[PDB]
Design a protein around this ligand. Sequence first.
Ligand SMILES: [Ca+2]
Ligand SMILES: [Ca+2]
Length: 83
Amino acid sequence: GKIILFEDVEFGGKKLELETSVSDLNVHGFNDIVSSIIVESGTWFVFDDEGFSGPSYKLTPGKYPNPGSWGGNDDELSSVKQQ
Ligand SMILES: [Ca+2]
Ligand SMILES: [Ca+2]
């Protein structure tokens, strides 16, 4: 699986590419800043709390240009897990 997290909407700003689960996005300086997402491959769950907990959102391959596109809130993702 490969997911790319973006600081700004419409795939702008700083980006973080991940191929493994991350229980705490702070380790990569990406806690509570994500505003768009591209899933290149795999199914991913993204969570608003650390540790694969809090509000969760399922994402399959494709582009998600704003948090509404995954049903979520801006600047709230804290952990991500591969399905
Ligand atoms: Ca942001
Ligand atoms: Ca959060």
